[PDB]
Design a binder for this molecule. Sequence first.
Ligand SMILES: Cc1cc2nc3c(=O)[nH]c(=O)nc-3n(C[C@H](O)[C@H](O)[C@H](O)COP(=O)(O)OP(=O)(O)OC[C@H]3O[C@@H](n4cnc5c(N)ncnc54)[C@H](O)[C@@H]3O)c2cc1C
Ligand SMILES: Cc1cc2nc3c(=O)[nH]c(=O)nc-3n(C[C@H](O)[C@H](O)[C@H](O)COP(=O)(O)OP(=O)(O)OC[C@H]3O[C@@H](n4cnc5c(N)ncnc54)[C@H](O)[C@@H]3O)c2cc1C
Ligand SMILES: N[C@@H](Cc1c[nH]c2ccccc12)C(=O)O
Ligand SMILES: N[C@@H](Cc1c[nH]c2ccccc12)C(=O)O
Ligand SMILES: [Mg+2]
Ligand SMILES: [Mg+2]
Lengths: 412, 414
Amino acid sequence: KHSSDICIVGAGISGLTCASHLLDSPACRGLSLRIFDMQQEAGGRIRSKMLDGKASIELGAGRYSPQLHPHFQSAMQHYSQKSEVYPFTQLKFKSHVQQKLKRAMNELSPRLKEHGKESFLQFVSRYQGHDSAVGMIRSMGYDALFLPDISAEMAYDIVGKHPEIQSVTDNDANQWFAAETGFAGLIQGIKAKVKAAGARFSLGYRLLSVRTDGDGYLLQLAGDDGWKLEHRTRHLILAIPPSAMAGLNVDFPEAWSGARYGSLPLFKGFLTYGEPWWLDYKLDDQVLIVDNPLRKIYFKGDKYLFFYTDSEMANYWRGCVAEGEDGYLEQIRTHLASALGIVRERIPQPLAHVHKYWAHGVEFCRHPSALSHRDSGIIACSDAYTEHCGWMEGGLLSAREASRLLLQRIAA
Amino acid sequence: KHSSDICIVGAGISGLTCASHLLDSPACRGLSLRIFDMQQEAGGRIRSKMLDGKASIELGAGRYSPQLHPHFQSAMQHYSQKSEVYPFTQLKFKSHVQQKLKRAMNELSPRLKEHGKESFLQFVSRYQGHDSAVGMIRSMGYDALFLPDISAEMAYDIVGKHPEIQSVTDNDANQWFAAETGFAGLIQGIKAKVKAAGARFSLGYRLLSVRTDGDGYLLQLAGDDGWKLEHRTRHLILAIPPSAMAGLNVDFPEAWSGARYGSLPLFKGFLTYGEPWWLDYKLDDQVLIVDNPLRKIYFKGDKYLFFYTDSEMANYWRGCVAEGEDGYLEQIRTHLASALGIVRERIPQPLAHVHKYWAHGVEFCRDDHPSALSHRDSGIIACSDAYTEHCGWMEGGLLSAREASRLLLQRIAA
Ligand SMILES: Cc1cc2nc3c(=O)[nH]c(=O)nc-3n(C[C@H](O)[C@H](O)[C@H](O)COP(=O)(O)OP(=O)(O)OC[C@H]3O[C@@H](n4cnc5c(N)ncnc54)[C@H](O)[C@@H]3O)c2cc1C
Ligand SMILES: Cc1cc2nc3c(=O)[nH]c(=O)nc-3n(C[C@H](O)[C@H](O)[C@H](O)COP(=O)(O)OP(=O)(O)OC[C@H]3O[C@@H](n4cnc5c(N)ncnc54)[C@H](O)[C@@H]3O)c2cc1C
Ligand SMILES: N[C@@H](Cc1c[nH]c2ccccc12)C(=O)O
Ligand SMILES: N[C@@H](Cc1c[nH]c2ccccc12)C(=O)O
Ligand SMILES: [Mg+2]
Ligand SMILES: [Mg+2]
């Protein structure tokens, strides 16, 4: 028999936190808990690596704020993970274009009850024309701000919650932190506690379909080596994002809430060198926002540099990687030269590099913390159902509602 | 998001060898060549690993014979890969049944003129008790021989070509060798040659569908991170096994061949320890064949032990692994103890272990099979060990590659 009292599908931060709240409850004593994830490691969109075995880099989530994410900060402290300052909170090379929009967003601000539901592009193109609003929006380096899908009110929220651009609004006093050893250290800590309390992990299995089976459920899964597996459980939490809920047979979203749901792709590229050649330019711990395809360029101490893009520009770099490594590195070299106002020859070739593309990097909200299927009583858990859609903090908030909803299914 | 004159899907030993034959031909000067594979490394069912950083193990193919496999032997020499003696060619500790094995099999062999194409379990059970047949057959450790789809004729060929049991049909003349650094060194040798001649690799991309498009073909591919990709080519080789052919939209096997194909699952588990405890029993470089679910147990010098199963026993171990690593390892200790005749508590715990399950480890033909195929309509060529006399061996992949390169070069010329 492959069975369990409680089953959680998804071992990101949401699924693992669900598991930990449940095992804390006296009402779960003597119940068995099983956790599935289609990946071979837990963590989901938290993915830490060593670049050339020298320094730790974040391929997914990278930074947090005590002002915006107090539950995440508390989790770091509870599991004895050390934080370090995240330096990329100002631009040394602020333009008047950047300066204008600060003032532009302040003056346009009251028109947001009037027009706040139209797109951010349509909104801003009233101050001056359309051409002028394109130059202002581009200077913030997040291309998702150009989507029709993103409203003016949504964009003011995005802008004010990101460290590179937060001073454009009046959130210039928020502080930002990174993990010394990488956020995978927090994931490992939660996983270890969950295992020590008796939960059993089955990594490398993908859920394909769910069917109600009297008072319980039957799950069909597929291992990454082809092995088919059936699992029966009495209580089910689906701790996966909306994009993955839609791939099941569970009538998502109509049977779960009114909303529709959307997502953005994200791309990050990291490069190391034989010598930290940007110290002469005094670029260490600085971020440059530029119009060319790198968009946002970061220099991390004397260790490495990287760039970060979303939406159409993320898809641009992923297609460029597919056409060959050679041209990819040569394209980066050209755009590093433009951004620094020098020639191509002054920029060395790298020793090593690494990149990551996330087809559904941010999944958002277009609404209670966690969801229930009206008929079957399955619970859904994701950062996209919260006010912190797009952030680890949202995963923690959804997990605590979701584990609450399930504790009342068990005591009913 | 581009194109090529020639495309190869499949970077196993078949696909890489196809590319090597093509790039060697004068007829491909100036032609561009693109290679796709859904894994992030080349090799296919050849998978070498460094287990606990002290010894190299084979999770897929592991042995070859110069007498049975001359082309594979020549390939090893061409790329300067060094070989070493493979020890598991005799049973030092035979059971009673295993000693009767060769004489029973020698006496039964003439009756294969009448009851030839019969299932091998039936054949052997017609001339002894069926209870006595089950005992004879299982003493050889390959559970494929109990399958209704395996004739008595196929079984005699399987027994005679495997090093642990070849002595049962007087094929001891065959020597066996393994690779000194792993067969991944052969694979890296061909890959570097093909790359140095200008071929381009796209690993991590899975072919989902192909359609004719005037001149050539349009391919839909999915990266292992979601990125969809469309690729255009004028000449196409699918160097993938029949199980993977079936998942496409190419009418396999109807539009390709008059045969049918099956497969067997395979499973291997490797274990290392703080101390080579099996030396006390003189088990180093020896293989035991047992009735219990380990079936075939191997002791590699003083470095590690492993076990190898197929068919229902391979699925048995894979199901065991799904229920948890702890129950798996305790199950292994129980069966090691009964194999050696001692109590559970004298078998140590392992430092490290690794296992691999192949859902379609062996693919073969059920029915004068040509070594490569061609689509009746579209001119796509298929390449695989399964289309040869040597189905289930790397030597078949080398043979199939030669024929596929020829078919493709005749369509490129003219
Ligand atoms: C590039 C990038 C940068 C980011 N930076 C930050 C940041 O700086 N600060 C911040 O707060 N957040 C950041 N995030 C977001 C953060 O990563 C997410 O908000 C959070 O990790 C989501 O947690 P989750 O557990 O809800 O979902 P996930 O991390 O997505 O985990 C979901 C899990 O469910 C599994 N799964 C899915 N489907 C199925 C199925 N059918 N069967 C089985 N298993 C399945 C998946 O494998 C996955 O592990 C970033 C994200 C990206 C992509
Ligand atoms: C456990 C085990 C032990 C073995 N031991 C031996 C031995 O000792 N001696 C011996 O000679 N042979 C042995 N073999 C067999 C040997 O591994 C194979 O015969 C040979 O390697 C197969 O070569 P191939 O290139 O034709 O196919 P494969 O190795 O199977 O290569 C096929 C490739 O195509 C890829 N692919 C498939 N489908 C698709 C798709 N839709 N899109 C994209 N890409 C795709 C796969 O990822 C794979 O890389 C063993 C096999 C196994 C499983
Ligand atoms: N805030 C995360 C990801 C993200 C959330 N919302 C976004 C909107 C647009 C682009 C990225 C995001 C980051 O630091 O990158
Ligand atoms: N030759 C491979 C695989 C194989 C070929 N024919 C087989 C029949 C049964 C089991 C495995 C095989 C091995 O001996 O391991
Ligand atoms: Mg999760
Ligand atoms: Mg191949």
